[PDB]
Amino acid sequence: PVNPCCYYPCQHQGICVRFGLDRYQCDCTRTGYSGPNCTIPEIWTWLRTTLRPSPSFIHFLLTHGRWLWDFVNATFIRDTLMRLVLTVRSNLIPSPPTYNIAHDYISWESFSNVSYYTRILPSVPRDCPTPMGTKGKKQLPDAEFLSRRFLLRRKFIPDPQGTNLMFAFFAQHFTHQFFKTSGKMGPGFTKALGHGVDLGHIYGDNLERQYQLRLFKDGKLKYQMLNGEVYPPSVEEAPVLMHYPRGIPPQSQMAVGQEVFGLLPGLMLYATIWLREHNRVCDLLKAEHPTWGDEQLFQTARLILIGETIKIVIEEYVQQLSGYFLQLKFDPELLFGAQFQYRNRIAMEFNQLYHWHPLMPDSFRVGPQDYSYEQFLFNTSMLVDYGVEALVDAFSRQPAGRIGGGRNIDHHILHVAVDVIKESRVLRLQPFNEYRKRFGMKPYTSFQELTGEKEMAAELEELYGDIDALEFYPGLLLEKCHPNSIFGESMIEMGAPFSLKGLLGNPICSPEYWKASTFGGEVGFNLVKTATLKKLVCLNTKTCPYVSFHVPD
Amino acid sequence: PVNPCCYYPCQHQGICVRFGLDRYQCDCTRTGYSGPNCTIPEIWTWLRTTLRPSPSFIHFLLTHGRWLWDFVNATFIRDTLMRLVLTVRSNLIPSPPTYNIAHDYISWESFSNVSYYTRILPSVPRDCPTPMGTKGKKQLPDAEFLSRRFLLRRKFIPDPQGTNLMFAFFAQHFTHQFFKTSGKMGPGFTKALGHGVDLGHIYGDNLERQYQLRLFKDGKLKYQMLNGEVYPPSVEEAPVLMHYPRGIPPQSQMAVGQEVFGLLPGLMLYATIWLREHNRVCDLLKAEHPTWGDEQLFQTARLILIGETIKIVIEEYVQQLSGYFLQLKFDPELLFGAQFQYRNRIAMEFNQLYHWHPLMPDSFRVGPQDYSYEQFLFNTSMLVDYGVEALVDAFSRQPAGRIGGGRNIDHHILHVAVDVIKESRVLRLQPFNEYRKRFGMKPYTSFQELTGEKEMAAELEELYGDIDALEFYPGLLLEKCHPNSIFGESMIEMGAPFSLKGLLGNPICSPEYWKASTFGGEVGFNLVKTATLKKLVCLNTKTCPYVSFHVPD
Numbered sequence A, B: 001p002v003n004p005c006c007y008y009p010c011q012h013q014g015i016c017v018r019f020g021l022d023r024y025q026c027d028c029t030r031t032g033y034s035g036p037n038c039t040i041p042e043i044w045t046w047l048r049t050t051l052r053p054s055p056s057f058i059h060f061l062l063t064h065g066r067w068l069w070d071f072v073n074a075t076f077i078r079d080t081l082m083r084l085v086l087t088v089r090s091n092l093i094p095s096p097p098t099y100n101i102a103h104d105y106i107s108w109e110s111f112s113n114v115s116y117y118t119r120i121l122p123s124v125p126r127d128c129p130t131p132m133g134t135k136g137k138k139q140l141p142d143a144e145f146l147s148r149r150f151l152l153r154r155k156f157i158p159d160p161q162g163t164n165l166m167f168a169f170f171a172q173h174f175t176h177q178f179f180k181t182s183g184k185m186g187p188g189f190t191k192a193l194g195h196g197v198d199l200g201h202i203y204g205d206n207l208e209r210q211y212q213l214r215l216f217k218d219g220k221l222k223y224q225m226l227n228g229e230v231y232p233p234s235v236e237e238a239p240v241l242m243h244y245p246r247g248i249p250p251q252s253q254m255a256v257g258q259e260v261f262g263l264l265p266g267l268m269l270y271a272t273i274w275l276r277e278h279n280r281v282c283d284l285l286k287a288e289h290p291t292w293g294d295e296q297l298f299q300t301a302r303l304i305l306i307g308e309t310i311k312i313v314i315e316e317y318v319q320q321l322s323g324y325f326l327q328l329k330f331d332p333e334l335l336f337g338a339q340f341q342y343r344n345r346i347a348m349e350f351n352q353l354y355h356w357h358p359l360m361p362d363s364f365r366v367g368p369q370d371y372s373y374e375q376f377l378f379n380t381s382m383l384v385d386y387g388v389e390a391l392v393d394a395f396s397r398q399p400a401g402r403i404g405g406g407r408n409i410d411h412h413i414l415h416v417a418v419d420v421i422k423e424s425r426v427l428r429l430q431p432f433n434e435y436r437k438r439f440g441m442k443p444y445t446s447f448q449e450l451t452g453e454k455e456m457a458a459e460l461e462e463l464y465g466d467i468d469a470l471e472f473y474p475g476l477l478l479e480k481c482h483p484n485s486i487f488g489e490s491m492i493e494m495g496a497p498f499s500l501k502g503l504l505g506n507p508i509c510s511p512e513y514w515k516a517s518t519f520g521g522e523v524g525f526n527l528v529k530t531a532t533l534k535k536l537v538c539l540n541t542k543t544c545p546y547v548s549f550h551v552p553d
């Protein structure tokens, strides 16, 4: 007998549940609806649904009122929209967390075994007719094909939004403090416990590792001078595991906190900037609190970075990304009067979604040079050879690549994408469309409607047979981008919730923590309130190059 | 130079902070006050402080309106008070959690290293003049003395509130799923991760252990028939660590989930009742969901116990305890419109406070027998010899002992108390009075005022020299109880916050979880909504003896 939850009867986030041998029941509790499948809008839902516009529309306003916005941006009308923007968006990611690769139902296990990445939607039943549940071919498109066919870059399509590589890496660096999959435990698990902005990619992700990394004096971080400039310490003092290639594990082999941060000048770069910052922070605090120990100086400085980070990510990273005229702003106080749960848990869907590999270029321009992957990948002197100043200047100037539209992933890394489509499958993520509904959108009615064009479209129908079958990852990257955008609609709609739920879900964002004493001194609190990319750099360098999340001119 | 935070200048929960070499600064943020030491009541605080009565008074109302209460108890006026009672009380325990034995300041470490028990107040600076900070003798009363002198029972003073041993144990059993100190890591740490009502004293506190305990079929729990009655399985099938004495580790050596639950028929007893329940639950669910696996049946059943437990503890355990005419009630919906954080973290102060060892009797009456400790402690057949029915009946009939007033701890166990006073000291808990303020009360002005009498009082002044020096644990147990009460004031005032913060902070209590699908079926949800002690027993026994948290007649 077909497991009825294979059709996904329940609507509006209603829990599907097997009853007896062949039946089921939807648990529409607090969904806003009622009925066998939750499709009978309570009086208010109906109102809200009849008065609420298309998110397609909002994106319009948010990206047009050249004037209306400068005025809104100059008055409280700002915080208002901010508070709004937040609440709504965030009210989507269930919290406490719901399911995981091992449980398509609430469990005390799912709740506490921090190991399991968490999911928004259950998985597609292991006994469902089709792979995605009901529609499609008994076999999903050969991922390797599906990749080169639609995701493989042909001509480098740069991001119309002006994004730059200086941003490209940061993303990567940053995003790697919570997305750490366990090869050992396999897909669906994560090393990076802590789920979120804890910088456990600077201070490592385990107590030992941190200590092997801590200079246990003045609360600073170990390090080494080369050319007179500060840089992360090598394993020969920082006895900690890494991933540098079998060559010169001694000198030039730097320890950071994030195992794989040596494999690319970019990650190591940032890894430097931060460390060089932390220590910098310490220098500041110690002045204010001589009677202070080491542990303190350290922890307090840590937070100040969790702060600065969460600010910069929002008021600059997410900004540039969004394309809004509305001036995003970080201020935990805006949720102080809401019903918010200060606690995040990384979702596998979030992970899949973040794979913005197409961001990467063709080559890596630097002044007159133009390092090819081979010269870049695993290179191990580029960083010290050129210097942060210069290197940053060299990224903030090279455009990144459109993350959507399709066909924009380089060939060298094209393999990742294939694995994501392969991994997605191990995980059993429901169809793109099922993941549009869950995130407040309408299911596409056809590949034509999906993609802006018709060429790819037709081919994809030929492959998936039915639009509903379409997968998660592919959907996102193949979706028609917004006009002059970096990526389509579904990306933002699905991303932000996860995104902001995690930026503001950080304990430091809670009333409890968000005090000036938590960052000891008013000096700490101001560093967090006034952080900037331009400052994260130039305050920790000899000279101030050009730094921004977008290209100049 | 004296570390100024040794005086505890900051008031109303204001953070004391060293600035420069010899100064300090109070961070009065959101405390309701302003000023160097936070003692300048903002306009509203002032109002609230000028209109709010003594908690001494409230306890009066809550324990007198014989009629007013039956009427309040019969109308919504009930839920109202309940919602009130909760919110207030709970709004005290900082959450996210603040400090731990290792940090007298917010830290990412303190936040995530679930190992550390957490504290409400910082510790008493390791460089303060006196042991408690400012006042007292450079040496605290020899704990061993202080114990036998004031806490050692002389004549058995039973609980005037009618409490019974059937309650006595439950307390112990129950309280042991979150209070598990690591001999290895030492005081200030805890094995029982999960902090709270997770029954990790049934299903053990680690994944392996659970599996060694799980019968992996129909989601039930391993077990064995003796006399035809169900009982926990012995290690010879349940290959899991225990603490039974070097004698017959084979038969009669039962595995439960809570290592030390063999050392007393009471704990093992309950341990049985629960298991016999869980399995019972399973039998029920499986009927409703044949298409169900094992893991599910298990997890779902687990929650139903976390439910039942949280209900019974409140609507019966806390009830009997309180002495209120108001009819306490468990209903997570009552906080759905509040700003509550579904997340607890056991506090060391909470632990200290819960040491209600004086609950224990002199001997252990059973029908005509009267087992002395020696015959009780570690006994290992009593349980199977007599039978749950009979045994329960035998506890629900023997009175417990006044937990306060002083001098009511038995000699056999009197050692625990001494260690608590010794442990408290390792921990460096601030003075009782400092812990009265923090919990919304006035500091006692004299030992006379503290104790209802004057004998003990005088002696204690002679020892501590100054009332303020008085310790935490001793304070509580030496405090004058309320009239016809089980224990003084400070106990409830300090206990409930921790207490209810933990009962309702359980994820199942969140909107997210609190659905009928979380307990799959409406049948599950009703088991939780209608749990009872009388039912926990009699539904899992041959016959229904006498069961209640108090003595009959």
Ligand SMILES: *[C@@H]1O[C@H](CO)[C@@H](O[C@@H]2O[C@H](CO)[C@@H](O[C@@H]3O[C@H](CO[C@@H]4O[C@H](CO)[C@@H](O)[C@H](O[C@H]5O[C@H](CO)[C@@H](O)[C@H](O)[C@@H]5O)[C@@H]4O)[C@@H](O)[C@H](O)[C@@H]3O)[C@H](O)[C@H]2NC(C)=O)[C@H](O)[C@H]1NC(C)=O
Pocket (backbone or CB within 6 Å): A102, A113, A115, A116, A185, B206, B207, B208, B211, B212, B239, B240
């Ligand atoms: C988060 O969640 C993951 C699980 O998804 C946790 O990691 C997994 O943990 C389990 C348990 O440690 C581990 O188990 C695997 O299963 C093998 C099967 O075991 C056998 O089958 C049953 C199970 O009890 C027994 O009847 C068998 O008999 C044994 O009985 C004796 C008892 O003393 C044994 O000593 C004797 O050897 C005998 O075989 C037997 O146990 C197990 O054998 C094998 O070791 C294997 O590891 C998973 O493999 C773990 N790995 C993962 C990622 O799945 C993770 O720990 C959780 N996180 C936290 C902190 O809770």
Ligand SMILES: *[C@@H]1O[C@H](CO)[C@@H](O[C@@H]2O[C@H](CO)[C@@H](O[C@@H]3O[C@H](CO[C@@H]4O[C@H](CO)[C@@H](O)[C@H](O[C@H]5O[C@H](CO)[C@@H](O)[C@H](O)[C@@H]5O)[C@@H]4O)[C@@H](O)[C@H](O)[C@@H]3O)[C@H](O)[C@H]2NC(C)=O)[C@H](O)[C@H]1NC(C)=O
Pocket (backbone or CB within 6 Å): A206, A207, A208, A211, A212, A239, A240, B102, B113, B115, B116, B185
């Ligand atoms: C929660 O919090 C507790 C801590 O309160 C965690 O448990 C403790 O964890 C620490 C770290 O594992 C452990 O450390 C102890 O300290 C000893 C001192 O170590 C030496 O001093 C410094 C420290 O790095 C080094 O310069 C020394 O040199 C070493 O360098 C080499 C590097 O490869 C070493 O291999 C070489 O041996 C050399 O000595 C040296 O490390 C440490 O040596 C000793 O092992 C000791 O364990 C605490 O003892 C732990 N125990 C407790 C309860 O305090 C707990 O893990 C946290 N929970 C979680 C999950 O995070």
Ligand code: COH
Pocket (backbone or CB within 6 Å): A168, A169, A171, A172, A175, A176, A179, A180, A181, A264, A351, A354, A355, A356, A357, A359, A360, A413, A415, A416, A417, A419, A420
């Ligand atoms: C938007 C962030 C981002 C960027 C810019 C990026 C840029 C690059 C890059 C360009 C220099 C190269 C050569 C790689 C190479 C890899 N990446 Co990424 N990756 C990124 C996010 C990820 C994520 C997320 C994963 C999956 C595992 C994890 O870390 O959680 C990943 C995994 C991988 C893997 C392992 C196999 C797999 O899971 O498919 C390789 C190899 N990569 N990556």
Ligand code: COH
Pocket (backbone or CB within 6 Å): B168, B169, B171, B172, B175, B176, B179, B180, B181, B264, B351, B354, B355, B356, B357, B359, B360, B413, B415, B416, B417, B419, B420
């Ligand atoms: C109100 C609950 C309660 C009860 C009724 C109770 C009843 C009894 C009892 C009666 C039959 C005996 C013989 C003991 C014996 C002991 N108890 Co308790 N204990 C209780 C709560 C605790 C707590 C709490 C601890 C501290 C450690 C922990 O488990 O977290 C404890 C610790 C102990 C210790 C270890 C040394 C120490 O920490 O002082 C012994 C021995 N005991 N206990």
Ligand SMILES: *[C@@H]1O[C@H](CO)[C@@H](O[C@@H]2O[C@H](CO)[C@@H](O)[C@H](O)[C@H]2NC(C)=O)[C@H](O)[C@H]1NC(C)=O
Pocket (backbone or CB within 6 Å): A369, A374, A375, A376, A377, A378, A379, A380, A381, A382, A383, A385, A386
């Ligand atoms: C790693 O990067 C260094 C530069 O930091 C590479 O050396 C440069 O190579 C180009 C041509 O390959 C020369 O024109 C530059 O002058 C070199 N820079 C200097 C001064 O050394 C090096 O070849 C790279 N290694 C790898 C992996 O290819």
Ligand SMILES: *[C@@H]1O[C@H](CO)[C@@H](O[C@@H]2O[C@H](CO)[C@@H](O)[C@H](O)[C@H]2NC(C)=O)[C@H](O)[C@H]1NC(C)=O
Pocket (backbone or CB within 6 Å): B369, B374, B375, B376, B377, B378, B379, B380, B381, B382, B383, B385, B386
């Ligand atoms: C453990 O408990 C058993 C009872 O379950 C004890 O045996 C009883 O002992 C009393 C006197 O000591 C007899 O009058 C009862 O008739 C006995 N019960 C039966 C039928 O065995 C036993 O002595 C206890 N063991 C210890 C540790 O003393």
Ligand SMILES: *[C@@H]1O[C@H](CO)[C@@H](O[C@H]2O[C@H](CO)[C@@H](O)[C@H](O)[C@H]2NC(C)=O)[C@H](O)[C@H]1NC(C)=O
Pocket (backbone or CB within 6 Å): A004, A007, A009, A010, A036, A037, A039
């Ligand atoms: C609720 O969802 C189910 C599942 O899709 C709907 O479909 C069932 O009933 C339909 C109408 O009678 C039939 O067309 C289908 O054969 C049947 N499918 C299954 C698998 O049950 C059902 O109609 C929905 N009910 C409502 C009120 O929309």
Ligand SMILES: *[C@@H]1O[C@H](CO)[C@@H](O[C@H]2O[C@H](CO)[C@@H](O)[C@H](O)[C@H]2NC(C)=O)[C@H](O)[C@H]1NC(C)=O
Pocket (backbone or CB within 6 Å): B004, B007, B009, B010, B036, B037, B039
């Ligand atoms: C704030 O708290 C301090 C600490 O107790 C108070 O005490 C200081 O100032 C008093 C009045 O001038 C003196 O009597 C004390 O010597 C001094 N003590 C210390 C250690 O600083 C201070 O008065 C308080 N201020 C207010 C406004 O109440």
Ligand SMILES: CC/C=C\C/C=C\C/C=C\C/C=C\C/C=C\CCCC(=O)O
Pocket (backbone or CB within 6 Å): A085, A086, A089, A196, A197, A313, A317, A318, A321, A322, A491, A492, A493, A494, A495, A496, A497, A498, A499, A500, A501, A502, A503
């Ligand atoms: C925990 C941090 C996680 C993510 C933070 C960084 C980037 C977010 C990733 C995806 C976000 C999706 C779209 C982003 C662009 C605009 C949305 C943000 C503003 C909004 O719409 O509420």
Ligand SMILES: CC/C=C\C/C=C\C/C=C\C/C=C\C/C=C\CCCC(=O)O
Pocket (backbone or CB within 6 Å): B085, B086, B089, B196, B197, B313, B317, B318, B321, B322, B491, B492, B493, B494, B495, B496, B497, B498, B499, B500, B501, B502, B503
């Ligand atoms: C996580 C569970 C922790 C504790 C639960 C069980 C017992 C509580 C322990 C101490 C509570 C202190 C006083 C109890 C008596 C009355 C208070 C409860 C009602 C109230 O005043 O809000």
Ligand SMILES: CCCCCCCCO[C@@H]1O[C@H](CO)[C@@H](O)[C@H](O)[C@H]1O
Pocket (backbone or CB within 6 Å): A051, A052, A053, A054, A056, A057, A060
């Ligand atoms: C619900 C009340 C407002 C009407 C909703 C209209 C939704 C129109 O939708 C949006 O309109 C924009 C221009 O208006 C277009 O640029 C967008 O592409 C389109 O999606």
Ligand SMILES: CCCCCCCCO[C@@H]1O[C@H](CO)[C@@H](O)[C@H](O)[C@H]1O
Pocket (backbone or CB within 6 Å): A064, A065, A066, A067, A068
């Ligand atoms: C080259 C830069 C100068 C541009 C001047 C014209 C700016 C018009 O700007 C926009 O025009 C819209 C009309 O479609 C109005 O609805 C908007 O409110 C206004 O911001």
Ligand SMILES: CCCCCCCCO[C@@H]1O[C@H](CO)[C@@H](O)[C@H](O)[C@H]1O
Pocket (backbone or CB within 6 Å): B051, B052, B053, B054, B056, B057, B060
């Ligand atoms: C603040 C507005 C109400 C007045 C507060 C009076 C506080 C009196 O206090 C309480 O009064 C009870 C009887 O009234 C006594 O039984 C209690 O022991 C006593 O503490």
Ligand SMILES: CCCCCCCCO[C@@H]1O[C@H](CO)[C@@H](O)[C@H](O)[C@H]1O
Pocket (backbone or CB within 6 Å): B064, B065, B066, B067, B068
């Ligand atoms: C032996 C049981 C019968 C008792 C009958 C008298 C009950 C009185 O009861 C109480 O009396 C108070 C007067 O002090 C009133 O203020 C209270 O409202 C009332 O509940």
Ligand SMILES: OC[C@H]1O[C@@H](O)[C@H](O)[C@@H](O)[C@@H]1O
Pocket (backbone or CB within 6 Å): A054, A055, A056, A058, A059, A084, A085, A088, A089, A440
């Ligand atoms: O994208 C426009 C809007 O779409 C809605 O569905 C979200 O809930 C809003 O928070 C968002 O601002």
Ligand SMILES: OC[C@H]1O[C@@H](O)[C@H](O)[C@@H](O)[C@@H]1O
Pocket (backbone or CB within 6 Å): B054, B055, B056, B058, B059, B084, B085, B088, B089, B440
């Ligand atoms: O004990 C009476 C009252 O005392 C107050 O301090 C608490 O905040 C209340 O929740 C409690 O009901």
